[PDB]
Structure 1
Amino acid sequence: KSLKNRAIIPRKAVKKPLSQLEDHLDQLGVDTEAIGLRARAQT
């Protein structure tokens, strides 16, 4: 956060990395291989 000087870019305007999403869900304890995030990933 730097809300004094600038606004935060909306989350929908930045494409999320599949590696970071998989890492976060794997830390949360979700079997990513059983759900197939690669198919949902765009290119």
Structure 2
Amino acid sequence: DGKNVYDYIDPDIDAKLQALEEEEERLEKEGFYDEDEEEEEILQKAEYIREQHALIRNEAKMRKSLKNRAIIPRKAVKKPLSQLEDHLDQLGVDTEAIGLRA
């Protein structure tokens, strides 16, 4: 198993072995090897926050473009009621407020 019998051969090796198992028994007796909800949910919340950060970074880099392209201003472009209502109720906005508008 990748080990040299020549390196590990030693006369009077029974004493060394017996010392080794005696030391092990001491170690388990002592506790050298004794293995010992809110945290899970807070970690889950943090992971969701990180996912949202990645998503918003992806949207930003998606809209960014590479080298200084002149873009149409928001006040010039027009946006649909479906998109506005969707975004608002994703943030949690009651939608009977909008509807007449334009």
- TM-score when normalising by structure 2: 0.32
CA distance in 1 between counterparts of 2:93 and 2:81 reads: 14
Runs of 4+ in 1 over 3 A off after TM superposition: 34-37
2:40 maps to 1:5: no
TM-score of the two chains, using structure 1 as the length reference? 0.65
Work out which structure has the larger RCO, using CA pairs closer than 8 Å and 6 or more positions apart in sequence.
1
Aligned pairs, number: 39
Q: Cα RMSD over matched residues?
A: 2.3
More strand by share: 1
Give the gaps of 5 or more residues in structure 2.
1-63
- Aligned counterparts of 1:35 and 1:15: Cα–Cα separation in 2: 16
Measured after TM superposition, the shift of residue 6 of structure 1 is 1.2
Structure 1: stretches of 5+ with no match in the other structure = none
| Higher Rg | 2
Equivalence map 1:5-24=2 (5 Å): 5-24=68-87
The structure whose residues are more often helix, as a share, is: 2
Percent of aligned pairs with the same residue? 95
Q: Distance in 1 between matches of 2:97 and 2:75?
A: 26
